[PDB]
Design a protein around this ligand. Structure first.
Ligand SMILES: *CC(=O)N1CCC(C(=O)Nc2ccc(OC)nc2)CC1
Ligand SMILES: *CC(=O)N1CCC(C(=O)Nc2ccc(OC)nc2)CC1
Lengths: 304, 304
């Protein structure tokens, strides 16, 4: 028992981290097979970031200008190309530690682990979620760009995020491994404000199921609700609308606990309207939304 | 910017996890050099756990009864011994992936990462703290015994915990890598109640410094206090006493932010007496105590 914000074991991803330097900018790259993926803003000076024309800046760069270092050994760059907001640096050596991998573009509400890196070296691993406004709330200092987000299914790493920037509000924006930003963000140092950071309702319900499974049951009430009634309350509290797809996804947790999804919705409705009254759920004084129903099942079953 | 509950990259520890089976019990072992460390309760049946005499149970065991599997390959056991509550199984092969390592016994308030494992396979990594009552609040299902806690200093892994049991209250107890339990706990299925789980004051202050560094400043007040005055309030709220050693340890955070430690104590005193009033600090509605001053400096500076 016990329920923790858990990240995937990071070993498979640590074996892929490299340092990429272009001129005076050094960030992280992801080495899979004979390709190193990194943010295209590695070619920018701090001045260039104000209004960069990436195609024009890239013309002044040759393969030998991209310095790629894996550990303390240099990789030879034999090609470079820009795909959306990422650069793909072809190297002459396949990464011997390349795990089975996929590039996936996640939806808002989906969680992933981040291996925060500096100078191609891993510093830490933490779990986060793609927010409904397409930002993530990470922990990234200068030099962390190119750090990646991922999920693991047994031995296959699904890379879903690459870090590119911090908005002026301290929230983070990045791309999938095809270089397409999540949300409307651009790799330019300009006014980019995030939209409403709503709560991921289906994740909160999954976490309330985890709480029941782990013995924290005080919030369970004698009520039920409907999807439409619940959603009226969810709208009021800036919670995402709950759909029948979400109810279906919560089915196995409902089955395990014997608590109907709409009954759990009614408990959540009362928590929104009455508050926690100084009480906690799974050691938290607020409703946690960075556990998906899949994460709750995985952690409560012990998937390796 | 941003501040997350971050675990150490787990790769170095993943390379040490093995499966240990004795009869019908299978748990995890830690393979360093030619020795596999595991909880001695691997020799117990579910019945034996009620009142085990480990020396007597061990007499009926031979090297060939300990099945050690690293990945899908079997290790040959050439010796076994009991050191306190851990078994040391000498194998004929040194772990080729053994990192530089130390065995350390941590003090309450100290944090570490746990690589939760099942059948010798890593399932997840999370960060926790040795509570002042010598329990940890982990996430451990059956089969997770032998999972370890650790800290990393660049390339050296300091192992500090091995998981052994879950108390009837859902909290966890375990040993250092010398097999000595933290706290008064025993590897027996008997009435073992934990003492008061007090809050780690020095860690809360470190986390309030992290909050200021990251822009969350609403809780800063116009007051100061003394160590004695603060401690009167800390006692009332089940917070650990703050010592001059703790104030000294917080010195670099005080220097970086320009906020004197006793001023931060006065802010914490007001948060204890007035509550959060529905507000949050670093995305939390309660005062976080599982970040040490060293963790705050490390995360706020980017140590790899
Ligand atoms: C995430 C990352 O690694 N980045 C590269 C460095 C970059 C940065 O520091 N930019 C910057 C420099 C100087 C000034 O002056 C106003 N502003 C921003 C952030 C992204
Ligand atoms: C942490 C771990 O791996 N453990 C080994 C299994 C053990 C267990 O499941 N014990 C147990 C079995 C049957 C009964 O019946 C009442 N109680 C406890 C827990 C520790």
């Amino acid at each position: 028992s016990g329920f923790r914000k858990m990240a995937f074991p990071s070993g498979k991803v640590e074996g892929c981290m490299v340092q990429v330097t272009c001129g005076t900018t050094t960030l992280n790259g992801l080495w899979l097979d004979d390709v190193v993926y990194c943010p295209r803003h590695v070619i920018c000076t701090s001045e260039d970031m104000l209004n960069p024309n990436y195609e024009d800046l890239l013309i002044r760069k040759s393969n030998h200008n991209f310095l790629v270092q894996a550990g303390n050994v240099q990789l030879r760059v034999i090609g470079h190309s820009m795909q959306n907001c990422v650069l793909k640096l072809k190297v002459d050596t396949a990464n011997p530690k390349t795990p089975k991998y996929k590039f996936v573009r996640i939806q808002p509400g989906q969680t992933f682990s981040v291996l925060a890196c500096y100078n191609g070296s891993p510093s830490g691993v933490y779990q986060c979620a793609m927010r409904p406004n397409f930002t993530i709330k990470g922990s990234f200092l200068n030099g962390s760009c190119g750090s990646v987000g991922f999920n693991i299914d047994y031995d296959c790493v699904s890379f879903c995020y690459m870090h590119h920037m911090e908005l002026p509000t301290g929230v983070h924006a990045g791309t999938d491994l095809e270089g397409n930003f999540y949300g409307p963000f651009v790799d330019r140092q300009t006014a980019q404000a995030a939209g409403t950071d709503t709560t991921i309702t289906v994740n909160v319900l999954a976490w309330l199921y985890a709480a029941v499974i782990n013995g924290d049951r005080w919030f369970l009430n004698r009520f039920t609700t409907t999807l439409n009634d619940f959603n009226l309350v969810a709208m009021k509290y800036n919670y995402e609308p709950l759909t029948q797809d979400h109810v279906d996804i919560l089915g196995p947790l409902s089955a395990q606990t014997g608590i109907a999804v709409l009954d759990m919705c009614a408990s959540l409705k009362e928590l929104l309207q009455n508050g926690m009254n100084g009480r906690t759920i799974l050691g938290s004084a607020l409703l946690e939304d960075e556990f998906t129903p899949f994460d709750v099942v995985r952690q409560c079953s012990g998937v390796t």
